[PDB]
Design a protein around this ligand. Structure first.
Ligand SMILES: Nc1ncnc2c1ncn2[C@@H]1O[C@H](COP(=O)(O)OP(=O)(O)OP(O)(O)=S)[C@@H](O)[C@H]1O
Ligand SMILES: Nc1ncnc2c1ncn2[C@@H]1O[C@H](COP(=O)(O)OP(=O)(O)OP(O)(O)=S)[C@@H](O)[C@H]1O
Ligand SMILES: Nc1ncnc2c1ncn2[C@@H]1O[C@H](COP(=O)(O)OP(=O)(O)OP(O)(O)=S)[C@@H](O)[C@H]1O
Ligand SMILES: Nc1ncnc2c1ncn2[C@@H]1O[C@H](COP(=O)(O)OP(=O)(O)OP(O)(O)=S)[C@@H](O)[C@H]1O
Lengths: 581, 452, 193
């Protein structure tokens, strides 16, 4: 017995068990089952983290402090270790006499021992060396007769995986459901447990840090429980505060709500930390930082920067994504350049984006690569592309390039993504999209914007339809995108500035090869003269750069007419851009 | 290692009849252990023990009543004996009937004995009033007595749902009436608590009512089995609801709908955008909606008959906001049921207990959803330390710039994100809107920003 | 590694990113005194699951020596940081005929903070092995090891060129260091940087 059980009731006498707050009805229901005549074996099922082991450790402290009924006064909660029961059990009947030595030593206690089998599903098949099952089956008469008083503690999905398979053993155990507590019921948990974490870390956890960690982790951590995911915010903020006290005027002591958000932003990646620093200035010039890469589109650079500023002020609707944009406009105007400039702003890497190219979803069955296959189908284990990219990095930009080139009901699967910020895999994992920017670039109305943007203002180019059949044909997808942007066609004064953006990309391509390039203001003007087509945006300029600059330049780099060290100067001699040294 | 097992050693003595063995395996442990040894299965005449009646269990519970009355020093009344075999037969599904009636009898006796030791409500008598208190704690299904504190909560159920769903009276009256029918014990025990087809236009309050219903009975919007039926556009996506068959990947994981309702049987099930599902996904919900019994891929039947299944859909949307100002609700529901007759099979429309037509929000509703969505913003700003005061001049900017009769109350939330929070986040970020001072949102003549 | 409860960090990332070469670099911050006062003099022990399951033929023999490791990790008075390369191997390791694996035996000791375990799974070996064991996934704080920039990989390669100049008796130049981090980032797609 004492070789195979830890005593939770003498762990509670020595103060080695944590204080257990709340769960007055889950301990009363687990006491009521333990006081039954037959089959007095309460099973604390619940999600992993909710406080199931802490109910038995708060029952063990309740039978010590005497807040328990008579009959449970003076019980012993003995944590049966079933790794120790199957430790040296090489020979036949060595586990089965270990298990019977426990059962016969539990019968000598005259029912004054509550048995705790934490991870109860590990009893289901513990001996198992000949054939039919040993533990479980050996405890099955004692559990049904009411002779163990065996508190279990499994998860909900290890109960059905292991214990509900043995339906005779599932019978012998009364499922006490341990629900995940509230954000309000885990503030009281974290308040009656902060002295244990103030003492281990030698810090002070302020009550704003207690309310923050319960509120922030409930919102921002999705694959975690309640008390479990709020404790390790105050546990890892205190661990980080103590590191910057012990290691490197310059030594704070308190754990505040700022240190909780600083560790939640390192956990999740969602930047919830603080907006007092030099990066508060980076958001005030977000439009200036996006206009270094997106010339024009003021009603779009403003609109996609307002939504980032709305989230970093804490003003974003927490039940929807950060922004949900439809970038409508012509070809080559900067719709996908803005989604690339935005991810370069937010993540400082251009490819740091969940860009779904929606011209692969022209069939309705292609929607199952956003979410994955259902159970039983091929590729089910792999999950989805959109769901597993946002499950890993929850603070994302999701670019849905060319949405009008998708099947018209692939956008059904985004009805939950934009309105509610959720999307479920085939594997049943609901991924939260509430910290993503979902951008949807499209070319709808491109013949209408190129025709009428000079005639109408932006307010009328966004509507300008009284009775015409279809501005946008999509029915109720359109009112859950929170801001629709019409992109405008690029004039010559914009394409003069994209000429300098696309040439600075060329200068860096050549200073990586040792060449130093000079444009003249006449060869820059000659690019902006024949790289300006109105209906094709700014790609005919990128063709006019690769044809009129990079095509003689690559022929003269290879021929050795242009050696590095000397400045290559691109000037107009006859109406053509030559490269002279 | 190579030695003789107990099966093969009794196999001579079992057949010869010198051993008068009685076995007591289950039906599943006989198959996977004894019936696989067909020479040993031969030696054993199986006496099938059936799960008894409710009336056979009331006779069982009356006989061992005194064996549980003597252990707990309570008296178990015969109303508690009858209501333990009746209630556990109805509300407990995984267990079998002598036992699950004894578990109610034993744990209600164990709780009364707690209530005399650990403290007319201190008395050693198990009544039918508190067999149900054990079963409502077993299952979560509120079958308890419900004296006055929750009786007053759902006498005002409509105006507690109208705190969050403004307008849609015929819809809040439809879901509040199904929760009163179940909690007065009048609901049909075979069907679910409610089956609701929430039709209507867009943005109109029909997923808001399921989130406010789940907030009513569970105090959390995310406490529903929310199933977005637009992930079920493929015919083979019913494997997400019920699970994979035996032999296939993720078969152990079970379903999503069945395994969520098998855990908590008193649920709200949201089937959002149900017309976007494949028309063979409604065949799964035929057995859910009438005699609620969806079966796993494992073959585990799940009782959905304590859930409120709500299927929100967008189907009369072109017809509702076109004709609601000229029709009463009786002629309008008559006219939208003609539209959903073409989308759903008449099998499935006949299972739904209440097809509810949501009406498009007027200007006086959107003026009141402005109060909800702005109070959500003030609670979003007192978390940051800022105190906002809207003007009544700026309330009728948002109730007019946010009033689009086609798109519901989402343009108003969009007007709040654009002409309240979009300039206010600029000023929280720039630091020129400091906390502590009360922030006043006025209008100059067309729009002025926060001022303190 | 320094928190009270559940103090198990894991360098989750992609293959090549530098997850095993953080615990190899935390085991050098420990010697050089570049850790806090709580990790001074600690020992990073690299538990391999391949030696625990090896020869564990009989009933109990994996359980005996894994409980023997846990009993010997407790004698250290919490001075040992355990390190499990390929942490997804533990989830199911020693799985006999119904008995719990190494994941279920370490589950009490991981959640209490007795094990100062470090894992080194990748992102998709964590998803298919550990994230299915949702109560073991809880006991493990995901330290996301991101793939570095080119500018961080030239700094990596400059620190390792002395270790590769010595194995091959060649001299690697810093243009060869910049080219290997710039060109492989552009042209190699299957590996991480
Ligand atoms: N009611 C509570 N009062 C105080 N602390 C609690 C409470 N509920 C949970 N905790 C703590 O929150 C964490 C939850 O971990 P446990 O409850 O031990 O794990 P569990 O609930 O058993 O879940 P699994 O499946 O065993 S991992 C521990 O640090 C507990 O001490
Ligand atoms: N407004 C702009 N500012 C800066 N560069 C631009 C702009 N518009 C286009 N470019 C350049 O031209 C390229 C093509 O523009 P894209 O935005 O990628 O195409 P698009 O405008 O998004 O429209 P499509 O063809 O329907 S995806 C970009 O990669 C940039 O290099
Ligand atoms: N009647 C209403 N009362 C209060 N808030 C409302 C109401 N209608 C809409 N809202 C708000 O607008 C949001 C969108 O409305 P929803 O009801 O969720 O959309 P819906 O009714 O499901 O229509 P569809 O078909 O899904 S677009 C809700 O989250 C609420 O915040
Ligand atoms: N930050 C770093 N500093 C120095 N060397 C590094 C760094 N990150 C990685 N390396 C080296 O780059 C290679 C990466 O290999 P590992 O880090 O062992 O593989 P990994 O990250 O553990 O991924 P696997 O395949 O899942 S074990 C090794 O040669 C390391 O020495």
């Amino acid at each position: 017995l004492k070789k195979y059980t830890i005593d939770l009731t003498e762990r509670a006498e020595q103060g080695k068990l944590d204080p257990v707050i709340g769960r007055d009805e889950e301990i009363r229901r687990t006491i009521q089952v333990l006081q039954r005549r037959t089959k007095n074996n309460p099973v604390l099922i619940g999600e992993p983290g909710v406080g199931k082991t802490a109910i038995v450790e708060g029952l063990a402290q309740r039978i010590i402090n005497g807040e328990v009924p008579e009959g449970l006064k003076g019980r012993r909660v003995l944590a049966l270790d079933m790794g120790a029961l199957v430790a040296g059990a090489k020979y036949r009947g060595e586990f089965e006499e270990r298990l019977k030595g426990v059962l016969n030593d539990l019968a000598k206690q005259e029912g004054n021992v509550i048995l705790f089998i934490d991870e109860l599903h590990t009893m289901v098949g513990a001996g198992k060396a000949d054939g039919a099952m040993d533990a479980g089956n050996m405890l099955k008469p004692a559990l049904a007769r009411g002779e163990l008083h065996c508190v279990g503690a499994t998860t909900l999905d290890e109960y059905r995986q292991y214990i509900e398979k043995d339906a005779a053993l599932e019978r012998r155990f009364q499922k006490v459901f341990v629900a995940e507590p509230s954000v309000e019921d885990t503030i009281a948990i974290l308040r009656g447990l902060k002295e244990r974490y103030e003492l281990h870390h030698h810090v002070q956890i302020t009550d704003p840090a207690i309310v923050a960690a319960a509120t922030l982790s409930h919102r921002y951590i999705a694959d975690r429980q309640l008390p479990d995911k709020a404790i390790d915010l105050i546990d890892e903020a205190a661990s980080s505060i103590r590191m910057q006290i012990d290691s490197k005027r310059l030594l704070r002591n308190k754990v505040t709500d700022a240190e909780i958000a600083e560790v939640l932003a390192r956990w999740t990646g969602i930047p919830v930390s603080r907006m007092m620093e030099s990066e508060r200035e980076k958001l005030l010039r977000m439009e200036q930082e996006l206009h270094h890469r997106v010339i024009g589109q003021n009603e779009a650079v403003d609109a996609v920067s307002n939504a980032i500023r709305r989230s970093r002020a804490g003003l974003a609707d927490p039940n929807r994504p950060i922004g949900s944009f439809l970038f409508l406009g012509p070809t080559g105007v900067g719709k996908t350049e803005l989604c690339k400039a935005l991810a370069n702003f937010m993540f400082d890497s251009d490819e740091a984006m969940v860009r779904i190219d929606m011209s692969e979803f022209m069939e309705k069955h292609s929607v199952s690569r956003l979410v994955g296959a259902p159970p039983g189908y091929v590729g089910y284990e792999e999950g989805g592309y959109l769901t597993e990219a946002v499950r890993r990095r929850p603070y994302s930009v999701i670019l849905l390039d060319e949405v009008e080139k998708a099947h018209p009901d692939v956008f059904n699967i985004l009805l939950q993504v934009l309105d509610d910020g959720r999307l479920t895999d085939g594997q049943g994992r609901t991924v939260d999209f509430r910290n993503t920017v979902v951008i949807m670039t499209s070319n709808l109305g491109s013949d209408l914007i190129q025709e009428r943007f000079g005639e109408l203002d932006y307010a009328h180019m966004k509507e300008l339809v009284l009775g015409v059949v279809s501005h946008n044909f999509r029915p109720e997808f359109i009112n859950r995108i929170d801001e629709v942007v019409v992109f405008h066609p690029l004039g010559e004064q914009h394409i003069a500035s994209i000429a300098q953006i696309q040439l600075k990309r060329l200068y860096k391509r050549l200073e990586e090869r040792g060449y130093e390039i000079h444009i003249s203001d006449e060869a820059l003007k000659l690019l902006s003269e024949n790289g300006y087509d109105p209906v094709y945006g700014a790609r005919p300029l990128k063709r006019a750069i690769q044809q009129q600059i990079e095509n003689p330049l690559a022929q003269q780099i290879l021929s050795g007419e242009l050696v590095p060290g000397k400045v290559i100067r691109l000037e107009v001699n006859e109406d053509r851009i030559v490269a002279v040294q």
